[PDB]
C-alpha cells in the first residue's frame, strides 16, 4: 500500500529551539500506521545547493507521529530550508520547509477553503481556482510579507492540496492543516494562528478568507479593516470585515493603489 507521509511546515523565531514534526501513514485514508520505526531527518542547509545534510534519527510512536528537535549546535539562522524525512525501512519520505524568522516578522494569512476556490462552499478534489487569487497572494509576497496558508482539511489530504497550490502557481508559503482527529477546523485554525503570534512572535497584519474565517481572525485580535472576506451577505459582512463584493481582480487593483485600508 502506498505511503502517505506528511511533515509540518515549521516556523520558528531565531534563537528558539527548532523542532520538526511529521506523520507516517500508509494508504489513502490512513488505514495503516507506521509505528516504532526509524526515520532519518535531512535538511538542505544551503537551500539552493540541492545538497542534503543528515541531522539525526527519530522513532515513530503508536499513532505514527514523530517529533525531532534540531540539536542547538546545528540550529539554522534566518531563512527558509527544505526538509526531508526518510523512513529507513522502505526509503519512503515526507517533505516540508523549516522557516526561521526574526522576531516580529510581518505576515499575511490566507484561509484557503472557499477563498482560493471559485465556490465559497463546494470543493471536491480539484476545484476551479477563483479569479485573481494568485495575483493577490503574489502582491503580498512581493510587498515583503511572509505568506501563511491555513486550511480546514485534514493533513491526510496534504499531498493533493499542495499539488493543487503548485498546479495553479501559488507563491511558496507556510502551509498548515487540521490534524484529522478532532474535527473543529475553525478551532484548529485559530489555535494554530495564535501559536504563531504568541510563540513564534509573528506580526500577522492581515487575514483573507470566507465568511466562516471572520471568527478565526477576530480571535486573533485582527481588526475588521485588516480582514478581507469574499461571500454574498453584504450588510452582515460589511459590519465585521472588509467585504470583497467585486472579487479579487478589482481588489488587486486597490492593493496596487495602496488604497485597501
> Which sequence spans correspond to the domains of the chain?
6-101, 106-257
The CATH code of domain 106-257 reads 3.40.50.1000
Q: If 0-12 CB within 10 Å is exposed, 13-18 middle and 19+ buried, where does residue 167 land?
A: exposed
Contact 42, 55 (CB under 8 A): yes
The CATH code of domain 6-101 reads 2.60.40.380
Contact 42, 53 (CB under 8 A): yes
Closest of 108, 135, 6, 104 to residue 60, by C-alpha: 6
User: Resolution to 1 decimal, in Å?
Assistant: 2.3
Distance CA 211, CA 221 (A): 16
Residue 37 gets the label, from left (phi > 0), alpha (psi -120 to 50) or beta, of beta
User: Determination technique for this PDB entry?
Assistant: X-ray
Long-range contacts of 164-171 (CB under 8 A, 24+ apart): 164/126, 167/126, 168/116, 168/129, 168/134, 169/134, 170/116, 170/133, 170/134, 170/137, 171/134, 171/137, 171/138, 171/141, 171/147
The residue written with cell numbers 512572535 in the block is: 201
3-class SS string, 27-84: CCCCCEECCCCEEEEEECCCCCCCCCEEEEEEECCCCCEEEEECCHHHCCCCEEEEEE
6-101 and 106-257, same CATH topology: no
Contact 119, 127 (CB under 8 A): yes
Torsion angles phi and psi, residue 45, rounded to 5? -65, -30
3 state DSSP class of 258: coil
With residues binned 3-state (H G I as helix, E B as strand, rest as coil), the percentages for the chain, rounded to 5, are 25, 35, 40
Q: At 242, which helix (H) or strand (E)?
A: strand 242-243
Amino acid at each position: 500500500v502506498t505511503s502517505n507521509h506528511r511533515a509540518s511546515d515549521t516556523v520558528v523565531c531565531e534563537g528558539r529551539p527548532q523542532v520538526l514534526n511529521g506523520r507516517f501513514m500508509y494508504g489513502p485514508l490512513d488505514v495503516v500506521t507506521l509505528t516504532g520505526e526509524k526515520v532519518d531527518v535531512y535538511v538542505m542547509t544551503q537551500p539552493l545547493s540541492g545538497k542534503w545534510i543528515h541531522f539525526g534519527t527519530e522513532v515513530t510512536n503508536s499513532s505514527g507521529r514523530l517529533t525531532f528537535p534540531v540539536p542547538s549546535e546545528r540550529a539554522l539562522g534566518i531563512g527558509v530550508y527544505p526538509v526531508r524525512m526518510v523512513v529507513r525501512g522502505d526509503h519512503t519520505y515526507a517533505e516540508c520547509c523549516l522557516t526561521v524568522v526574526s522576531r516580529g516578522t510581518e505576515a499575511v494569512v490566507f484561509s484557503i477553503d472557499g477563498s482560493f476556490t471559485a465556490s465559497v462552499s463546494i470543493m471536491g478534489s480539484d476545484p476551479k481556482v477563483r479569479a485573481g487569487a494568485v495575483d493577490v497572494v503574489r502582491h503580498w509576497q512581493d510587498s515583503g510579507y511572509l505568506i501563511v496558508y491555513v486550511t480546514g482539511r485534514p493533513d491526510m489530504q496534504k499531498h493533493r492540496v499542495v499539488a493543487w497550490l503548485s498546479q495553479h502557481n501559488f507563491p511558496h508559503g507556510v502551509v498548515s492543516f487540521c490534524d484529522g482527529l478532532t474535527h473543529d477546523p475553525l478551532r484548529q485554525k485559530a489555535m494554530f494562528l495564535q501559536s504563531l503570534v504568541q510563540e513564534v512572535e509573528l506580526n500577522i497584519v492581515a487575514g483573507y478568507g470566507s465568511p466562516k474565517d471572520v471568527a478565526v481572525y477576530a480571535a486573533l485580535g485582527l481588526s475588521p479593516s485588516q480582514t478581507y472576506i469574499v461571500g454574498r451577505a453584504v450588510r452582515k459582512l460589511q459590519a465585521q470585515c472588509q467585504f470583497l463584493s467585486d472579487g479579487y481582480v478589482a481588489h488587486l487593483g486597490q492593493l496596487e493603489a495602496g488604497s485597501h485600508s
